[PDB]
Amino acid sequence: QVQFKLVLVGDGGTGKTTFVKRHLTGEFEKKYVATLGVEVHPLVFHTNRGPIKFNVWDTAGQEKFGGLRDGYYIQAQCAIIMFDVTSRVTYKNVPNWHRDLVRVCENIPIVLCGNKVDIKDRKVKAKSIVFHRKKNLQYYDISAKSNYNFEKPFLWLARKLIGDPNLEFVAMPALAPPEVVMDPALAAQYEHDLEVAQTTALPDEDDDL
């Protein structure tokens, strides 16, 4: 319906895919599996102006896996440029990504995101991050891991795309859930599945939650 093409660009390892997955499923993927060319995922937010759908084109940051490269940007309606605040080279490359992006997409809203602020030893100092000012990009410190500011890039983009500065995310309707009884035939398989689940430790047991 109301859907917008969003392209996500930035150096390999900056957290693009992890960030999208967090938003898609709620999970935090610890492993680094490099994106091959691009992965497309629809992502819906519920707002006080109705649902907004982003078709997220999560592009490869590794040169060797770049695929169609700027070919992915064609007809994008918005974008996120990612870097990693623990890696100065990734900030240094931001102008390169931005160059390639705006050559294809001349007038779109773009958010610049400095990811991994959860890591204690920050290398790209806050005071250093100024590239967005002359390019009219929005900027946020974010962490896919802690969820710090994780909703901000999508909220800002939605506001710009719908053209409503007072747009807010709203609680989606919660339909009454059904009453189901376990299949007696599957009860023995239930026992096994639960045993494996019980004996697989939960991750990050030192976290606040």
> In terms of CB distance, is 28 or 162 closer to ligand GNP?
28
Of 76 and 144, which has the nearer Cβ to ligand GNP?
144
DSSP result, 139-200: EEE--TTT-TTTTHHHHHHHHHHHT-TT--B-PPP-PPPPP-PPPGGGHHHHHHHHHHHHTS
Q: How far is the CB of 202 from other proteins (least distance, A)?
A: 5
Breaks (C-N over 2.5 A) in the chain follow: none
3-class secondary-structure state, position 6: strand
| Contact track, Mg ion, 12-41, x by CB under 5 A | ----xx-----------------x------
Contact track, ligand GNP, 12-51, x by CB under 6 A? xxxxxxx----------xxxx-xx----------------
Report whether 200 belongs to an annotated binding site: no
Contact letters (x/-) for ligand GNP, 124-143, by CB under 6 A?
A: -------------------x
Q: Using the rule CB under 6 A, is 190 a contact of ligand GNP?
A: no
3-state secondary structure 49-109: CEEEEEEEEEECCCHHHCCCHHHHHCCCCEEEEEEECCCHHHHHCHHHHHHHHHHHCCCCC
What whole-number distance in Å separates Cα of residue 147 and Cα of residue 28?
A: 10
Whether 34 has a binding-site annotation, put simply, is yes
Was 144 annotated as part of a binding site?
Answer: yes
Binding site for ligand GNP (CB under 6 A): 10, 12-18, 29-32, 34-35, 60-62, 115-116, 118-119, 143-145
Annotated binding-site residues read 11-18, 29-35, 61, 115-118, 143-145
